[PDB]
Amino acid sequence: KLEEILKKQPLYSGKAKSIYEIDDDKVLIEFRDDITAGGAKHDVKQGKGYLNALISSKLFEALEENGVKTHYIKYIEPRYMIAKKVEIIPIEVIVRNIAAGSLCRRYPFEEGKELPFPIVQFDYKNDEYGDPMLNEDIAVALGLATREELNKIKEIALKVNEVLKKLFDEKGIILVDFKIEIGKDREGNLLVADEISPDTMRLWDKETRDVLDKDVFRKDLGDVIAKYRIVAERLGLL
Ligand SMILES: Nc1ncnc2c1ncn2[C@@H]1O[C@H](COP(=O)(O)OP(=O)(O)O)[C@@H](O)[C@H]1O
Numbered sequence: 388k389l390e391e392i393l394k395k396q397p398l399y400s401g402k403a404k405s406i407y408e409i410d411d412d413k414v415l416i417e418f419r420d421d422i423t424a425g426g427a428k429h430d431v432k433q434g435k436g437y438l439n440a441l442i443s444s445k446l447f448e449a450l451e452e453n454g455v456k457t458h459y460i461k462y463i464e465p466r467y468m469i470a471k472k473v474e475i476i477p478i479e480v481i482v483r484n485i486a487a488g489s490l491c492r493r494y495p496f497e498e499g500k501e502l503p504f505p506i507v508q509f510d511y512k513n514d515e516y517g518d519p520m521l522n523e524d525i526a527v528a529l530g531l532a533t534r535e536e537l538n539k540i541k542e543i544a545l546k547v548n549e550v551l552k553k554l555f556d557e558k559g560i561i562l563v564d565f566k567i568e569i570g571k572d573r574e575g576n577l578l579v580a581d582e583i584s585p586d587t588m589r590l591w592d593k594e595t596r597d598v599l600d601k602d603v604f605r606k607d608l609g610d611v612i613a614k615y616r617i618v619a620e621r622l623g624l625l
Pocket residue numbers: 399400401402403404405406414458470471472473474475568570580581582
């Protein structure tokens with residue numbers, strides 16, 4: 388409300404979005420058209436922020452409908468999101484249904500193979516150290532969060548997975564894996580924050596298994612935005 392909030396200087400600006408202040412417990416998130424990979428690979432593609440903001444709002448709404456508490460308040464066309472302000476826990480929570488990305492790179496897993504169960508991986512969000520994977524003991528010792536919190540985070544992650552996986556599967560999409568971030572609101576509540584989009588999920592077409600996520604950009608597979616749009620279309624957002 389009073390969208391001219393954009394004229395202010397962002398509380399924080401990252402490689403893909405800008406966080407603007409609205410008040411004490413709310414922020415405006417701007418999904419820019421910046422797309423990155425590696426972030427040694429970069430470009431600006433028209434419609435990226437629009438599509439990710441649109442997809443993200445729908446997925447958060449779906450999560451909220453299944454009981455998952457998120458930071459989502461509302462979507463403001465074309466690429467804005469009003470969210471509850473939270474203090475992000477410096478951990479990237481990765482849930483994997485199919486082996487891909489670093490998993491196949493670091494361990495003897497066959498690419499595209501269905502995992503026996505959703506693997507949950509916690510990566511430390513720290514550029515200086517190259518976002519190293521963590522184990523519970525390390526995370527606690529670093530003071531990133533308590534054991535109780537870490538496990539609650541895992542529970543939330545798996546719930547998010549069951550909801551999203553079922554949803555995309557019904558839309559002919561295979562949710563390979565995804566990365567979420569969690570933060571605490573003013574009341575100390577653990578909320579799924581950041582975004583849930585083709586930038587943070589690996590999505591394959593069920594039939595052909597064509598890539599529909601940011602991997603087409605990092606691996607130059609074709610029209611990234613056109614594939615991102617396929618996701619929007621599949622979710623009935625266009
Ligand atoms: N509701 C929120 N409250 C405060 N900051 C948030 C919220 N959601 C996400 N963020 C922060 O916004 C940033 C996202 O920017 P990008 O998406 O630019 O991440 P980088 O900052 O690229 O990892 C992250 O640092 C994330 O922790």
